[PDB]
Symmetry: D2
Subunit: 292 residues, 4 copies
């Protein structure tokens, strides 16, 4: 549902840069077998930026069909114009996705009030559960805990993917929201810490290639066995870091290809092919995780 | 024209958020009479983020029509997907615009090599002059001088709107590019400094309401009379700062309304109306400038 | 010892700016009665910067005598020259203090290697236990976890006061050091979080005026009762923040005076008297904590 | 003299870390012959941090004696306790120095009002000209233009060494102070830009090894011939950056040794010897400058 290890899944592509169904099916079977709790379809790791809204919807629906009721699917629905966010959200109403992951508007730098009105209008135009998403280093905008508290009073807004890497936010948000409001890390390197402070899981890039370890780590964390969870985190830490050695998802798509999970590591510009030095860096991190 | 005071013009709207032709005409007439060098149509101050490409194109064509050859027009054509930037550029090919202002991809955070490939591809598939546009605080990425140097070798990449507010970039870029490559500030508060270091002009928000002063200040700067340009800049400095007291273009659309230059100050979400405190702060800035 | 709520005690002064013994004794009796685990004497909150080494030693020794074996006393021994740090440390050898709190050199910005050699030489010139102290916003220098791991192999170096406010450091340091190496927060607002991640206590400014609450919070935290600890933290949070509304220790000395714990709130330049607006801000925070 | 190229001179040392008179003499003779405007004795590049006040004073008196009236000498007199700065200043009253360079208190992080009171008190109790010195990355605090404006009204506060590398400060300060208040860069890499914006000179680390070039570059800058000054600056730019590849003055003392200007490159802890990689990087920078 909205708990444990949730993969921010890549959108695997053929050499032409279009979705490759056989590779997507291989990934979804892998996440079912691995114990991944849910899939976020067409977030930033899934190249939401370079897919148009039609292509993006086609991938979400294909992901849903291929999941075949075995694993819940959350759609990325973020947009920097409120009307476009509503419109994109409506494509998925009565579709079968369990919720939406919707980012703070990027580039136009709204105020906290602008953020409130933006997410509130979106929530009012759907019955789908809404997971807020804050990532200031991408967006230029920072959804502060106080505004998260405000928005959590909307029945429809049920959690946050917090990707600042600033762990003080866990308890700042938690004291302001109800006990069933869900706190998800959006930063793999600090995600176990995030959970140790009272977070309920992680929307993860690492999970794309280390799904079993990630699911086991988040289960141990939820059961309070933090020391046993750290043994896994330490195994996974070079990956947590090196999967951003070049802009995400360039590294994780290369790693997927190296593990035979996808046929090609093709991306859409302005993402470019991984460098040679990047390959060797990601290879060593996979080696340290015990996957190669 | 790509020197002097260039206005990043607002897209004036009626109460429903649709472009208001009569207000736009008045603004354009104002810029013709006030000596503004050119108009940037549908950049961030023109709410590029919340217009769809159809409306974006309509506003540019309307600006061209209303300008009626009296003032050059540069279209904002930025996008975070390379194919989308190319497509948008194609809509304006034989439109009458003199050039394009194209931002670094926002949100997806490409590498320097990705930026190179992004802008090279856009440049290839048009004859129109291209002005690069760097604004890290909005985009999450930073086009460094080295990469600006590589891109300046492309014949129709002719300049940069540099909006870091980091003044060391003027001469780091200048030494790496040829003498006819144009360096334009995108940060009103540091713009006079920017020109004094070697910059050729400014793509300005302040120019929306202080067009005559901005034009004279930029001319004095180009003539080397920096002391007499600073006197004007000192009067304009509260405006340079307080036009961003709330997210741009909220303050400047309000200012345009207060001066009678536009019928309403309506914006599209996620921009929201100016607060009372911002009303007061902007009004005092306009009075310091001698505009009220 | 090196655990629980450790107060970074103010150096109370008469109006002439010299240590006031009656006020210091009142504070030490208060910390004994309150359950404070230890006193840090003449750290930054105790105005180490504006006391010369003689005056600073006189205060440490006076604090020790007045403590009278009832509560352990750690001496501040930091200096930005290694030879001065050794010399200051040696004044306290065979004195009765239980350990030293020694800051990364400020102003001269040493390398990580410089930090290693600096603290290693200090440790080799004493039998006293050494607590490393990292506060980049004051010093201009950041002791990274890797170097902390290196230094922890010195028998004599036994813990760190980590005052970054960056909680990722707790587990980065912990995986690199032995299980008896002590992790202390140096940032009151994030200190409970710090403890929840595996920290062993806090060297606290808040403890100066809320010693009982602080001791109870750290005991609850050490016993894993984090939710009961947060009720206290929330009570104490305006203090955690507002005790730095003006430069520390200007606010906490005013608060001490207001609570009748010290006779005067006098400080040495360049610290200046609290502003009127600062008084009312600190008063409200004391009120919220239930102390006024 | 308080314009032009002013060298923040190294304090050359023998293998035991004591001032080496013969190396110092050679440096001073070099600066007299090379057209350096003045010598800052015992600033941070002169290891003020690791000399005690006795040695600090000795080095200044030795510099004065060796200079023998041929070059003006400014003593570093900065301290983080106001009474200590006053005392240090008193040691130099009728010494022959032309002025003092006094840093914002480091570590204790005073307010703007504290900085005002700090520097006003120092100024009151001497007749010597005072140059304020702002370097936030070392000190943890930032003397803002507003406060520089208040302090410039004090008759013997005559200028500022501005080492933010933030070039907007040149004209923010200039408009708030009188025309004979001197604005000096403390950041070699942005110094030419600083002078082009209105600055009068630089207190420079690079000048230790490229004194002739620095003197000519600063003169060309003062004459308004910025293009011909930039050619020199372009040759010096790798030195401007790589003299801080490791903490200053480690690289520059090594460079001085490599050129034969000083007998050894010894420093005092917590500064440590240059690494092999830094040896290589600085040597290539010296060759780019045409010095080897």
């Amino acid at each position: 549902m909205f708990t444990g290890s949730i993969v921010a899944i890549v959108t695997p592509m053929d050499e032409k840069g279009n979705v490759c169904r056989a590779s997507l099916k291989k990934l979804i079977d892998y996440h079912v077998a691995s114990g991944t709790s849910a899939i976020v379809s067409v977030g930033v790791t899934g190249e939401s930026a370079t897919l148009n809204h039609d292509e993006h919807a086609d991938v979400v629906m294909m992901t849903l069909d291929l999941a075949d009721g075995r694993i819940p699917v959350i759609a990325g629905t973020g947009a920097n114009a409120t009307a476009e966010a509503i419109s994109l959200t409506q494509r998925f109403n009565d579709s079968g996705i369990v919720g939406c992951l919707t980012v703070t508007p990027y580039y136009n730098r709204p105020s906290q009030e602008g953020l409130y009105q933006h997410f509130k209008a979106i929530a009012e135009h759907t019955d789908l559960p809404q997971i807020l998403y804050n990532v200031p280093s991408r967006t230029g905008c920072d959804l502060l805990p106080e505004t998260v508290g405000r928005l959590a009073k909307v029945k429809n807004i049920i959690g946050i993917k917090e990707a600042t890497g600033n762990l003080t936010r866990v308890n700042q948000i938690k004291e302001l929201v109800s006990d069933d409001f869900v706190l998800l890390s959006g930063d793999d390197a600090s995600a176990l810490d995030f959970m140790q402070l009272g977070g309920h899981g992680v929307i993860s890039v690492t999970a794309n290639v280390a799904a079993r370890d990630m699911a086991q780590m988040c289960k141990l964390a939820a059961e309070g066995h933090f020391a046993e969870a750290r043994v896994i985190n330490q195994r996974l830490m070079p990956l947590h870091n090196k999967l951003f050695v070049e802009p995400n998802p360039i590294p994780v798509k290369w790693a997927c290809k190296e593990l035979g999970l996808v046929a090609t590591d093709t991306l859409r510009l302005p993402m470019t092919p991984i460098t040679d030095s990047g390959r060797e860096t990601v290879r060593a991190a996979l080696k340290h995780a015990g996957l190669l």
